[PDB]
Structure formats: structure tokens, C-alpha cells
Amino acid sequence: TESDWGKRCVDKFDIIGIIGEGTYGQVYKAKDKDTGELVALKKVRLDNEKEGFPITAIREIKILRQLIHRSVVNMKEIVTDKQDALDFKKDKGAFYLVFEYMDHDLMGLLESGLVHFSEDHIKSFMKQLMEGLEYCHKKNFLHRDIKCSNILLNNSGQIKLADFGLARLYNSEESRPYTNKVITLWYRPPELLLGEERYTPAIDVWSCGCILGELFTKKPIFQANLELAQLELISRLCGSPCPAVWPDVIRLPYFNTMKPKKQYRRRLREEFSFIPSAALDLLDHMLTLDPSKRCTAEQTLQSDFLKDVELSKMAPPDLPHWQDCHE
Amino acid sequence: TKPCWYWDKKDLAHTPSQLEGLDPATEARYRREGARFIFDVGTRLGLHYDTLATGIIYFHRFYMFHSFKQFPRYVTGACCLFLAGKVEETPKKCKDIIKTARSLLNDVQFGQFGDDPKEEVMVLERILLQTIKFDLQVEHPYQFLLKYAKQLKGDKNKIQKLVQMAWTFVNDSLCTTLSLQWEPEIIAVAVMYLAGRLCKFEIQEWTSKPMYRRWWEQFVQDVPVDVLEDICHQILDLYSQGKQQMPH
Amino acid sequence: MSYNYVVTAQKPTAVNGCVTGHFTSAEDLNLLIAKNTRLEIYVVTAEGLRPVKEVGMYGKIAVMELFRPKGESKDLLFILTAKYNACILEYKQSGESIDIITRAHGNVQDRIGRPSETGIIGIIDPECRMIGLRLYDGLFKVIPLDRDNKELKAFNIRLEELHVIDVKFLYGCQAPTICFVYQDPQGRHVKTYEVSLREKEFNKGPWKQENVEAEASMVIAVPEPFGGAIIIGQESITYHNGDKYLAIAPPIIKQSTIVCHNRVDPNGSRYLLGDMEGRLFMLLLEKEEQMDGTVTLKDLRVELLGETSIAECLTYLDNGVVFVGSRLGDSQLVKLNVDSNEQGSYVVAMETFTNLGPIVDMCVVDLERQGQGQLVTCSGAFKEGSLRIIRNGQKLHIRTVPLYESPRKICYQEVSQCFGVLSSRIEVQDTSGGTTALRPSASTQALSSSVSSSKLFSSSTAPHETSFGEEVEVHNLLIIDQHTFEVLHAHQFLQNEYALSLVSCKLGKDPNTYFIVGTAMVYPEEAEPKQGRIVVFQYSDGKLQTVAEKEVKGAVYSMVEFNGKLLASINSTVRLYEWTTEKELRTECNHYNNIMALYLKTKGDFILVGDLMRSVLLLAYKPMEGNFEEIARDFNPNWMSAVEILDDDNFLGAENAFNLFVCQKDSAATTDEERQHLQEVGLFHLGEFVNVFCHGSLVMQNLGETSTPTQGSVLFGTVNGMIGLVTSLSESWYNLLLDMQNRLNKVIKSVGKIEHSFWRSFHTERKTEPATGFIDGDLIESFLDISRPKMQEVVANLQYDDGSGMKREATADDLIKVVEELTRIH
Numbered sequence A: 001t002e003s004d005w006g007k008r009c010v011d012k013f014d015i016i017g018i019i020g021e022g023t024y025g026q027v028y029k030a031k032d033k034d035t036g037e038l039v040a041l042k043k044v045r046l047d048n049e050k051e052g053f054p055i056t057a058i059r060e061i062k063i064l065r066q067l068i069h070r071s072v073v074n075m076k077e078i079v080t081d082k083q084d085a086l087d088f089k090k091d092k093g094a095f096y097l098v099f100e101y102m103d104h105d106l107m108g109l110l111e112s113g114l115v116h117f118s119e120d121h122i123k124s125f126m127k128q129l130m131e132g133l134e135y136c137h138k139k140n141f142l143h144r145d146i147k148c149s150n151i152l153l154n155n156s157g158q159i160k161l162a163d164f165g166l167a168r169l170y171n172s173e174e175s176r177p178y179t180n181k182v183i184t185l186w187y188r189p190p191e192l193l194l195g196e197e198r199y200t201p202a203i204d205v206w207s208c209g210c211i212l213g214e215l216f217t218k219k220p221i222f223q224a225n226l227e228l229a230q231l232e233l234i235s236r237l238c239g240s241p242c243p244a245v246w247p248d249v250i251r252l253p254y255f256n257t258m259k260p261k262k263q264y265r266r267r268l269r270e271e272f273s274f275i276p277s278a279a280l281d282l283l284d285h286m287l288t289l290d291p292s293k294r295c296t297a298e299q300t301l302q303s304d305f306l307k308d309v310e311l312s313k314m315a316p317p318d319l320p321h322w323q324d325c326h327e
Numbered sequence B: 001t002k003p004c005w006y007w008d009k010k011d012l013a014h015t016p017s018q019l020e021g022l023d024p025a026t027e028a029r030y031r032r033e034g035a036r037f038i039f040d041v042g043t044r045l046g047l048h049y050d051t052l053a054t055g056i057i058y059f060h061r062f063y064m065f066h067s068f069k070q071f072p073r074y075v076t077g078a079c080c081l082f083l084a085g086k087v088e089e090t091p092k093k094c095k096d097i098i099k100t101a102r103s104l105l106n107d108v109q110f111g112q113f114g115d116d117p118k119e120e121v122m123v124l125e126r127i128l129l130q131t132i133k134f135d136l137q138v139e140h141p142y143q144f145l146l147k148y149a150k151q152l153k154g155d156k157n158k159i160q161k162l163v164q165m166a167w168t169f170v171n172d173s174l175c176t177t178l179s180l181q182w183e184p185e186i187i188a189v190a191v192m193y194l195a196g197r198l199c200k201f202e203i204q205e206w207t208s209k210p211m212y213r214r215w216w217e218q219f220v221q222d223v224p225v226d227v228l229e230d231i232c233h234q235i236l237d238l239y240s241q242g243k244q245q246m247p248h
Numbered sequence C: 001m002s003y004n005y006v007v008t009a010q011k012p013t014a015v016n017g018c019v020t021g022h023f024t025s026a027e028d029l030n031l032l033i034a035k036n037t038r039l040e041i042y043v044v045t046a047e048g049l050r051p052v053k054e055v056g057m058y059g060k061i062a063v064m065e066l067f068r069p070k071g072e073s074k075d076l077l078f079i080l081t082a083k084y085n086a087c088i089l090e091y092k093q094s095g096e097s098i099d100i101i102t103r104a105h106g107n108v109q110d111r112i113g114r115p116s117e118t119g120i121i122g123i124i125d126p127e128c129r130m131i132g133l134r135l136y137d138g139l140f141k142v143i144p145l146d147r148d149n150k151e152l153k154a155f156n157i158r159l160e161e162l163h164v165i166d167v168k169f170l171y172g173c174q175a176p177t178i179c180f181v182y183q184d185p186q187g188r189h190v191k192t193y194e195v196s197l198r199e200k201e202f203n204k205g206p207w208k209q210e211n212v213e214a215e216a217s218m219v220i221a222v223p224e225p226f227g228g229a230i231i232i233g234q235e236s237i238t239y240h241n242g243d244k245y246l247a248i249a250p251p252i253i254k255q256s257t258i259v260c261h262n263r264v265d266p267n268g269s270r271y272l273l274g275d276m277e278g279r280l281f282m283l284l285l286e287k288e289e290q291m292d293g294t295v296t297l298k299d300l301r302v303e304l305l306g307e308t309s310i311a312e313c314l315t316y317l318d319n320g321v322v323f324v325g326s327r328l329g330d331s332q333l334v335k336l337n338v339d340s341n342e343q344g345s346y347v348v349a350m351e352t353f354t355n356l357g358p359i360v361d362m363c364v365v366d367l368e369r370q371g372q373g374q375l376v377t378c379s380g381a382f383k384e385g386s387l388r389i390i391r392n393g394q395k396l397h398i399r400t401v402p403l404y405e406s407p408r409k410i411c412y413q414e415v416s417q418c419f420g421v422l423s424s425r426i427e428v429q430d431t432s433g434g435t436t437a438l439r440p441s442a443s444t445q446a447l448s449s450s451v452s453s454s455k456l457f458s459s460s461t462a463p464h465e466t467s468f469g470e471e472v473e474v475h476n477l478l479i480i481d482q483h484t485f486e487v488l489h490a491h492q493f494l495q496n497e498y499a500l501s502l503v504s505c506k507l508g509k510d511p512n513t514y515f516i517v518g519t520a521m522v523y524p525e526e527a528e529p530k531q532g533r534i535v536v537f538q539y540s541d542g543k544l545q546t547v548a549e550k551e552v553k554g555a556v557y558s559m560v561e562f563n564g565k566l567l568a569s570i571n572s573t574v575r576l577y578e579w580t581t582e583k584e585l586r587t588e589c590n591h592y593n594n595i596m597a598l599y600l601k602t603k604g605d606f607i608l609v610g611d612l613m614r615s616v617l618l619l620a621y622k623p624m625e626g627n628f629e630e631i632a633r634d635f636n637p638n639w640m641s642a643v644e645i646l647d648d649d650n651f652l653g654a655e656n657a658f659n660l661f662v663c664q665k666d667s668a669a670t671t672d673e674e675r676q677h678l679q680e681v682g683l684f685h686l687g688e689f690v691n692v693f694c695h696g697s698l699v700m701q702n703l704g705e706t707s708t709p710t711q712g713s714v715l716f717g718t719v720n721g722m723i724g725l726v727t728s729l730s731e732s733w734y735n736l737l738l739d740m741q742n743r744l745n746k747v748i749k750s751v752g753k754i755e756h757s758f759w760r761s762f763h764t765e766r767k768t769e770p771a772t773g774f775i776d777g778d779l780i781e782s783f784l785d786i787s788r789p790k791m792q793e794v795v796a797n798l799q800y801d802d803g804s805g806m807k808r809e810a811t812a813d814d815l816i817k818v819v820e821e822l823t824r825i826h
């Protein structure tokens, strides 16, 4: 049946080429021999066998077989290399996690300079992203690695969230010790720069607010190399962490350690004054310092900016593929 | 989409182990020993109760597809716990599981692990994953025992006694094939039902529908008493066969 | 790691801007001409221009303006680079010693902002109270010109109009005032604001908004006799002064877009307008005086003067002389006469300044058989299109072969003693239903001619409608003699067929040498072409014969000969075709893992692929199997403009951001994942847009000179006319020349006090990295121009390595020998 995963062979796919270096293996583009569908194959190498099957891949299998959403990447099956006949101990063959092939990733499109987003294009994008994040959050999962490179976009305007290799369940009743450094420095929230270790789903909201800002400038908002420099940049824009705006900042391991140059005032509305009012309000609420005052995913979907955006009118972003050859 | 992980009691007469000459009593004994091995090993390592149960469920499912005569049970158990730890985010290093398994197993028993215990275990992960069809998410009677008990209102102490007694029945049911016969939601109700009889409690009075005598129906739809009593019979058989008695 | 050296062989020639004023002395009339990264200063005479000074800047010149604040004797110069480096400059001369003073400087980049569509705009107040900058959508940056602002500190005023087309400071206003055209959903509008330095905000401007033409493009600040603005469009010219509206819509200007303007009479009575077909107009402001004592604008008139080169910037000098600064053709001095000549023209050319224009393609061939290379380029656009033949002999000798249409690709065919050139010319839909060319050109002035009669797409059934006056491109293959540069033949391709790629080669066991062209069927409706051809031609006995055609399902962006087989890139696919004994192309293998296979290069059985957005991939032909295999891909995303293979391991690429990089195989063969990874080991900001990489050199090889430190030779051509050269170094030679750069940067004084390390930094809107693996040869070659004190200051405590002697001290004359050898690579 369709549900008996791990047995079908990767022979069933014509490999088209390598599309990325992954975490637990290389990622390949391929075509299904039987249906003609294009897939993305994430290879799992257990040949190292330091700790066996990688937990990163286990997270993606465990979570993505539970999550069903139009904006969450879909795992279709798991297939294997030709297994050694009657010799399971020698068998070192790999497993491949089968995904739908998405035409692009947001970083590559932004890094190549080949995208332009109108306000209505940003509405269509963010409504999908937040709806997908809300689906995950209602199910009590944290993505913990929201960056532009983990948002896949195909040319119809459809957005899908992608790398769940750091996703873990969130319990509100039971506070759980989590890993301190989860999101890429550029999209990391201030609460984790101070080492929260018990963070809320609001970490993902911060990242998406950073993306929201980036889509209006085409340049990331907080670009730093070191955790202190990052806190400085966030502070120059959002204001310095202080009990006046984040009463519990004093409980954080590094609050006294990682002081910014000044106690800055918030200028987010000034430095982003070229943004539409409905959107600027969303950015200000998503880039709130105190995670308990930072809006939820749902609250973004019930905002003037995204509330009345209709998904039937997807407006695909302006990806030009002609006049690129000759300017 | 998703696989079927439940069988009929009658179907356990045709497990691979049985058709290779193992008798019903022996396979169940092996199942108890393997499950309890998983439970004891993980408890020594400080593992969460869900992590122990997930490994035990992997174990029970495994031996619906393989024979104990070809897969030594303690190796399988150790492997299931090892994978369960990664699945449930309570990971342990394989060497530490082996260390604990050696502490608890005699010389004959640890012979199953062969000359290289860690290798025999790590090698099996491939088979374990293909066997469980990569359906790694598992639900257990515990979460339902608590979800349903939270909706009971009354004497704090009588309900807590009900929960603890039922919780023990859940731990004891992991040694059996009930995990393969009934969904966890049904197991949680059955153990509440059993504790109620043993505690001489009438649970309906704690529900929002106190004159609904079949109190469980508002938790688990479509469950006959036939089922809950079969489950109770199977749990108490465990106590009668052994020397141990009901907790009360 | 990899070590490479980059030098300029020809400096940028396209004119990016031109201003006039009194910069060198309060007395002289100056002409400042800006080429990319280069500033040329002239003095206006009665015969032409006297050059006086040329400087380079460590940046692309984006804004250039002259102004004279109260208290200065002479004009000061403001320049802003494209990396947002600002400075104020002064000319100072001490007898024979000429130098450029940096009076104020700083970088005005904002941490947060959206780069505007119409680019950086810089303007200066008529009272020289402030500099206005439009860098980002929704913001207006003000640098106040106070004596103390030596760092050019500035502030931003929120601007409600996000999409600004153009802005100027107006004349005749009680306060500093801006007039700007902006676009919102309701169309375009003209609006005015006042700028208050005291309040650091906008106040309501002098006059009311008016709705303007949908394609309103330029704002002219009309000076004091008639104060106001003139708004230039596609169809109309409109004057606004507050209560005044005047609109002339003469049919002559609708034909071609006007792109430049300049003031002739300082009273504003006459302005010059130029258009994209080379036409030069006079915009005349008719004045009526009132007994009130006040002058008013009565009417506007437009009069055609003649033809110039398609000009980016115009500047009127004096008497009848105008400087025409072109970016697509040669720049000029032209004289405007009061009397027309017998053809009706008032314009007569005086001098012509060579512009290698856009270099769309080029090849190196030895026409003279002198063991030295000649570079034949595809240069220019439209009526300014040309072939240019460049040879070394101390200056470069350049011959111009006018084509009067756009050249696209060039390839040399020795067997036929001629070149093949792809070209395109503009025709316009005319009343016959067909089209009519605006001018005769190479494809129409060929000795013999032919037209494709292919029936491949003949079935069509795709409806495409035509409106009178619309433009179309007509593409041709030109056969051009290598000695006369006579157009011997011209082959016209199908209607709506673009010629994209061209090769000359033999295939298989076929002894004939062919011209092969790859095309694309381009319809306005399509996002990406879905039909195309590979055509095999034979040039024989003055006639081009069609040998075979292969239909493809896309655009044949690139082709290259591959060991007797034809390697073609069709959209995402990279394909290898074999040439059968029946003289037809037959596919052998395909590789599909691309986004758009824009560029192809080969070496042996290895293929370097340039992708639209996925940087560069290294493929290999596995002959034992008859298929392609992937060797390594650069996973960093970049938009490629051209690529080239340096050696079996190092690969060169050019970005649309004016940046260069080098990728190398990881050569750590432990894991397959390492081997499939191309590491960007070289990063460098050239500041030019490279269209074509080409192996070869123009230098002579009589062997009098020695084996230079440099090995290899790649020439590259750019949009601004620059010809550059990339070559490799040994680890030892790099470290020396690199250590020497850091020493030179401390010694050499930069114009605008721009850090060299900043200029050559890799720069995209999203990234900035320090340069690596590249020696700025133009910096090294400047050691020979610095004074002796500075030379000895550079060589202090300098030690060689990996040499005959492991540690060797350098003397000034030691370096002069090395640098002078390095100057001989071009």
C-alpha cells in the first residue's frame, strides 16, 4: 500500500542532479519514472553510524507525516538504495526522503536579485507563511529555524515552509529546557540572544517579522557576525532590552553581560516610514522585544494587512525570466 | 496514507514466531521479558515514561513481522529504546544503553549481543525503521488517562486514587499485546473502568453527565463493554498468573 | 586557495555624465566628463578641448555636480559613488603641480532603505545651501552645506510619495524648493515641497500639483527670467509655474523617446533635447514682457537641428559647440549653425571621440599573421553599432567598421577568410502591414542576401496582433570579409526569431566548415521562449547555404564545439548533438539540472555551465557511457553575466552586480559531498559589467621579454567599453603583490578619501565581503607613478618568500623591475 514506507527503491526515480548540500545528506532533484512528477530527494546517510539514523531526519519524518497544510512542505514517501540480499548487517545503503519539487527557494531568488515584491505580492506571501506557521503552532510545534532559505516558493505564488530539522513540541504547562542557539543569527530573536533556553513559539514570529521587513527592502534587517553585534543592531532599531519594556529581561542569563552601547529608543516606525501603514503596524508588532508582548501568528492573520487578503488571487511575485539574457 | 497497527487476538496465533514452532505461552513470555527489559533499562537511564512506552510499542509491533528465533529479543529491545529516545527527544548514546543492559542482564542473556554489542544494536536500526514503516509518532494510554481524568470533578482523593491505580494498569499492559489490539484511547478508558470496579467508585457521578451510566462514551465513541471487559480480563490475568496482586 | 591578477587594458570609454563650470579656475570654462570610475577635466578653447587632468576614483561615479558656495572664488565638485561614498573636491594648481583636494567626505548609506527604481538622484540648491539626494523610496536625504560639515553628515525627511521619477531644486523661491514627478496608482503627477533646514522637514510647496503625462520622464528647473519647471514626456512638453500651464505636443517627438536635456542660454530661453535615434532638438521659450515690468512665458516651440550620436548626456560649451556624451556610440563635439546646410541640417560634426560602446561579444584572431593578437569586438547599439578591431602598437590602435544596426555575436571562420556576425535592426509596423527600417544598415547593404524559408513553425496557429508604429527586431547573420570588412552576405531569420548564439566549426567526419546559429522564437506573450532552431549554414562561393535545421523546444542561449559534437544549452537543458553521415544533428546526451543555461564553456571532456541564478556548475562528458555527469556546483546563488575556464580546477565568473569570483574544485577527496562543492576562493569587485570572457592576448611574443610572473591570459569586455585581463599567479608572487598593495594603500592618497579595500570589496545589496584571491593590478601598476620618497616608504621592511633566497629585502628599484614586467602583459 501507499503507507508501507522504506521498501520502495530509489530506482523508481531518474536523478536530475544535486540541488543543495543538506544537513544529514545531499538533496537531489529527480523525476518519478512512473508518474513523471518532479520530486526532491533528501538523502539520509547512516553509514557514519556515530549515532545511527540522524535525529534531524527523525524530526522531519515524525513531524511532516502529522502536518497537512497548503503552506507546509509535504513528504511523499521514503525510499532506499538497493539493499544487500540476505545480509542486513553489511547493508550500508541510504534512505531518501521524498518531497515535492518546488521551483525556487526565497534566498536564491533574493540573493540572485531576480525577485520584486509589490505590496500585494507581500500580502499573498505573508498570509501563506503565517497560516502555515499558525497551523504548526496550533499543533504545538516550533520550527526553530525560520530563514529565507527554508521558505520554498514555486512560480504560481505558492509558499511552503520546508526544513523541520529543528522542530520540537512546545508545552505551555510544562516549561522544557531547550537548546539555546536555534535560529540563524540574522533571524534569531532577542530572547535567545540572551539565552532564554525556555522560549515560546514567538521565536518563529520574530523571524517572520524579519522576513517581512526584508521583503520591503530586499536586504535582511539584522546582519551581524557575532551575537553581541546582533543585539546591538536589533537595539538600534527596536530599542534596548530593559525592564521598562520587557519586565522579565532581568531573569535572562546574559542581560547584565550583553549590554548594548546605549539604552536606545525605538525607531522602527521612523526607519521604516516608507512602508504602508497596515504593514508597518504588523512589522512593529512582530518585532516586539518581549516575547509575551510579541503578537501571535493568529494575530497577524487578523490584522489589517493580511486579514482581507484572498488566497484565490495569489499574485505570483515578479520573477522575470526574459530580458535577463540581454539587458 | 497511514498504516494499520492493530490486529485481532485470533491473529496472534499466526505470528512468524508461532509458525516457526514457538508456543503461545513462550512468545508471550518473550514479549513480557523484552518489554520489561526495555522498561528496566530506560528507567535506570532516567527516561521519560513516553520514551519507555514508545520503545515497547516498536518492540511489540516488530515481532508481528519477525520471529524471536531469528532476532534476539534483548538486542531488539535495546534497539527499540535507542530509537525511541531519538523519536521522543530523550536521546541516549548507544554505548550507554549497552552499559545498562550489561548491568541488568546475566552472562547468558548478554550473549545475545554477540561479540560486539553496540554493532548488533546499531545494525538493527535499519530493519527496525523499515519494519515500523517509518510511522514513528505513537500515542499512549497515559495522555488520555490524564485528559479524561481532568474532566472528572469530585473528591480530589478518590479521583487521584483512580488515576494512580489506572496508571499502574497502563504500565502493566505494556507487557501484553493489548497495544496491538486496541487504540490507546480505549486502553485508558479500560484502565479507568477497572480501577473504578476495584475502588468501588461510580465514575458517572464525576462526569458532566451524571445520569449517563456508560460514562466512557463521552470520551471514546463506539466502545462496547465487551471490549473494556476483555481488556480488563487480560490485565488481571497478568496479576493472577504471577504472584503479584492488584495495587489497591 | 587561488591567486589571480586583474589589469585594465583599455579604460572605460562610455560617457556617464558631463557638466560645465568654473572648476579649475574662476576664469576658465571647464568641461568635466565622467566615465565609469574615471574623471576627465578639460578647458574649453575656441578649437575644442584642452585636457588638463584625469583622476581615478575608487568607486563608480553616480552623481557629479559643480557648485560655488558664497565665499568661494571658484566652483567645487560634488561626487557620490554608487556605493554611497560622498565627497566635495577642489582643484589646486601650484605651477606645474596639479592635485585634487578632498574638502569633505563620508559615506551616506542608510542601514534600512529600499533602492529606488530610477536610481540615485543628486541635486544642489541654487543658493548652494544644501545637497539633495534621492537614494531610497520614501526618503529624501539632505546634506546641508555648512562650513563645518566636513564629514557630510545628513538627515532624512519622510517622503510620502514612494515612487519618484525625477526631482530638481527650483529657481526663484523664497525657500529651498523641490519639484518632482511621482507615480502612484492614479497616474503621474508633479508636486512641489519646501525644505526647511531649521525644522528638518518639508513644508507645503509654492504651487499646486498637476496631473502630467503617464510617461513624464524629466524635470527641468527653468532659471530666473521665467522661473518654473519644464516636464518632458514621450508625447508632450509642459511648463508649470504655479498658475501657469503651457503644453506643446508636436508630433515629431512622439517618434523617439527624449533622454537628455541641457540649458543653452543662461536665461532659460533655449534648451537642448536629445532622443534615442540621435535627433537633437532645440526647445525655445517664447517670452512676452508686461508693462508691469515682469516677463512671462508666452509659448513653447520645438525645432529639429540634426543628428548626433545616441547621447546619454549633452552639454553646450560656447559659441556653437556642443559636447555629445554617448554611452552607446562615439562621443562628439558638434557645431550648431544658424544657417542649415543643403540637406536641411544645422549640425555639423567637429571631432569624434572613440567609444568601444557596449561590447556584446568579441573574439581574438590574428589577421596580420604577426604572431600578435587582434581583438574584433561587437560594439555599440542601434545606429551606433559597429565592429572595432583593436591591436597593440604606446597606445592601442582601433579601427571602426560601422554597421548602423546592433551586433550581437561574432565568430571567426578562417577557411572562409571572413567573420560571421549576428545582428539585429529595428523596423516599425507601417501602413502596408509589414515593417519599414528607419535607416539602411549592414543587413540591408550586403552584396548578396537570403531569407530563411523554414517551415518548422509555419503551422503557427498562434495569433499575434500588430499596431502601426510598434517596433520589432529583425535578426540576421552577416558574413564579413576579414580584410575589407565588407558585408559579403546577409541572412535574415524568421519573423520573431532571435539569433542568440553563433559558432564556426567542423563536426564529426564532415570536412566542411559551417556557421551554426542557435535561435529563439520570441513572442511578447511568452515569459520564456518555447520554440527555437539550431541552423547549420555553409558559406561557399559568396552564398550562404542552409545545410540542416534542428527544431528545439526553447531558446538556444549558448553553443560551443565539443570534440566534433555540438554542445547546446536550450533553456534549462544542456545537450550534446552528434553530426551524422546524413548531415543532420542527432542528440546523444542531456543534462537538465539548471534554471536557465545561459553560458557554456568547455575544456577537454569538461563543461562549465553558467546559470541564470545558480552560479556555475562543472559537468563532464563520460565517453565510456555516452552521458553527462555532475562534477561540482557553486551553491552560492549569483546572477551570471559571463563565465570562463581558467584551468582544469579554477573557474571564473562575473556577476550582474559588477563583481568577479573564482571557484575551484575542493580537492579534498575524503567525501563525495566535498568533491561536489565548488568553493568561491576568489572574490573581487571590478566595477564593470563583463559580457564576454575570451582567451588570448594582444601582446607580442618575439621572446625578447621573459616568462612573466603571470601565467595564462583571459581578456574580458564590458558594457562601458573597458577591456580587462585576468591572469594567474604563484602563491609566492601573490603574497608579494598583496603585501605590496597594503603598503601602497597606506601611501597613495585617494580621491574622496575612499578606502581602496572598500572599493574592491564584493558588494551586492544583500552581501559585502572583503576581496580575496585577486591582485588589483591597476594599483600595482601605480607604484611606477608615485614619487621617489613614496616608493622607498613602500619598500621599507619588505621581504620576499619561497624564492632562491627564503627572506630577501626589497629596494625601490627591485620593485620597479617587477612592476614594469607586469605592465608588459598588455
Ligand SMILES: CC(C)n1cnc2c(NCc3nc4cc(Cl)c(Cl)cc4[nH]3)nc(N3CCOCC3)nc21
Residues within 6 Å of the ligand: A018, A019, A020, A021, A022, A027, A029, A040, A041, A042, A073, A099, A100, A101, A102, A103, A104, A105, A149, A152, A162, A163, C593, C594, C595, C614, C633
Ligand atoms: C527537499 C525539499 C525541502 N525541497 C523541495 N523542493 C526544494 C527546493 N527547490 C528550489 C530549487 N530548485 C533548484 C534547482 C537548482 Cl539547479 C538548484 Cl542548483 C537549486 C534549486 N533549488 N529546494 C530545496 N532546498 C534549496 C536550498 O537548499 C536546500 C534544498 N529544498 C526543496
